[PDB]
Amino acid sequence: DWRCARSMHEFSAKDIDGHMVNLDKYRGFVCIVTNVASQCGKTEVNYTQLVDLHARYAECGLRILAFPCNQFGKQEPGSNEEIKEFAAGYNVKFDMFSKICVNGDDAHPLWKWMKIQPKGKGILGNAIKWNFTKFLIDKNGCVVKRYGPMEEPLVIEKDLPHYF
């Protein structure tokens, strides 16, 4: 059960093309996991800065897992195919997943799990508050920090390992 898991690597998720991804493929990599939306006021800053971080740190082992989610103002209403083409317009080369829920009983189990981790706790409760919450995940799959919807992705850069 998701509650008993100790690492992101115990989970799987469908990517935006429908391929089932075992998240153990991220073992050994530092990851940013984020819920995305195409129709949010911070869509541009988040996509552009995530693409910039990936360009600068993929060769150090940074990976980015983007989960579309329509739970926040109906700001991700499109199909998975439309969302894939949208991300391609920002030159995304990181990993896009199929649309999910992040809150409530239908939330994807990875997201249920991240929200209860010691470093995954929110500033005022654990629910994801809006589009573009970010979790930094260490090479062992543990949550190391959470960044809310108003945090630009570039704020995560200082928190990456000293070897990056």
UniProtKB/Swiss-Prot annotation:
Keyword Flavoprotein assigned: no
Impact upon substituting A87T: In a patient affected by cryptorchidism
GO process annotations (BP): apoptotic process; arachidonate metabolic process; cerebellum development; chromatin organization; dendrite development; lipoxygenase pathway; long-chain fatty acid biosynthetic process; multicellular organism growth
The reaction(s) this protein catalyses: a hydroperoxy polyunsaturated fatty acid + 2 glutathione = a hydroxy polyunsaturated fatty acid + glutathione disulfide + H2O; 2 glutathione + H2O2 = glutathione disulfide + 2 H2O; tert-butyl hydroperoxide + 2 glutathione = tert-butanol + glutathione disulfide + H2O; cumene hydroperoxide + 2 glutathione = 2-phenylpropan-2-ol + glutathione disulfide + H2O
The keyword Cytoplasm is annotated on this UniProt entry: yes
EC number: 1.11.1.12, 1.11.1.9
Tissue specificity note: Present primarily in testis. Expressed in platelets (at protein level).
Top-tier EC class: oxidoreductase
Modification Phosphoserine, positions: S7
Entry's Gene Ontology cellular component terms: cytosol; extracellular exosome; mitochondrion; nuclear envelope; nucleus; protein-containing complex
Keyword terms of this UniProt record: Cytoplasm, Developmental protein, Dwarfism, Lipid metabolism, Mitochondrion, Oxidoreductase, Peroxidase, Phosphoprotein, Selenocysteine, Transit peptide
Catalytic-site annotation from UniProt: C40
Protein family according to the UniProt entry: Belongs to the glutathione peroxidase family.
Disease: Spondylometaphyseal dysplasia, Sedaghatian type: A form of spondylometaphyseal dysplasia, a group of short stature disorders distinguished by abnormalities in the vertebrae and the metaphyses of the tubular bones. SMDS is a neonatal lethal form characterized by severe metaphyseal chondrodysplasia with mild limb shortening, platyspondyly, cardiac conduction defects, and central nervous system abnormalities.
Function: Essential antioxidant peroxidase that directly reduces phospholipid hydroperoxide even if they are incorporated in membranes and lipoproteins. Can also reduce cholesterol hydroperoxide and thymine hydroperoxide. Plays a key role in protecting cells from oxidative damage by preventing membrane lipid peroxidation. Required to prevent cells from ferroptosis, a non-apoptotic cell death resulting from an iron-dependent accumulation of lipid reactive oxygen species.
Name recorded for this polypeptide: Phospholipid hydroperoxide glutathione peroxidase GPX4
Phylogenetic classification of the source organism: Eukaryota, Metazoa, Chordata, Craniata, Vertebrata
